[PDB]
Design a protein around this ligand. Sequence first.
Ligand SMILES: Cc1cc(C(=O)NN)no1
Ligand SMILES: [Cl-]
Length: 145
Amino acid sequence: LPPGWEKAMSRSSGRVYYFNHITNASQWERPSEPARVRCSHLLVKHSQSRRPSSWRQEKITRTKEEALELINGYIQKIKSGEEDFESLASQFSDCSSAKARGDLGAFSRGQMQKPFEDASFALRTGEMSGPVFTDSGIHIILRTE
Ligand SMILES: Cc1cc(C(=O)NN)no1
Ligand SMILES: [Cl-]
């Protein structure tokens, strides 16, 4: 399988699924390096973030566990089609890039924080990560180019 992917078994159904230990994506379907990639993201900050402040909230006080629960619920709405990634990022990302529907532009290895860089370069064009942890908080990442 492509870099990072492995097999596992569902606890509740008994059916095989696929999981990526670099991007934290998981799916039923069997999964299908460049100098630069282009990505968007949605950030949820918490009280242990490097800078616990954002354009949404002068003082960010939620716990790391509470932030992960918010990220999990946004992923559910994106996967069911109830909401679009771009819409949720504009309304709820704790990054100034919410301004641009989460778009960060193109970048190379050596510029972003290392777990974000590794996840971005393990995604295929069109693919979305699961929760990704950095010193800034917890992210959902979409590779666009
Ligand atoms: C939700 C999902 C992922 C995929 C896939 O990776 N196909 N190669 N298809 O549907
Ligand atoms: Cl690709």
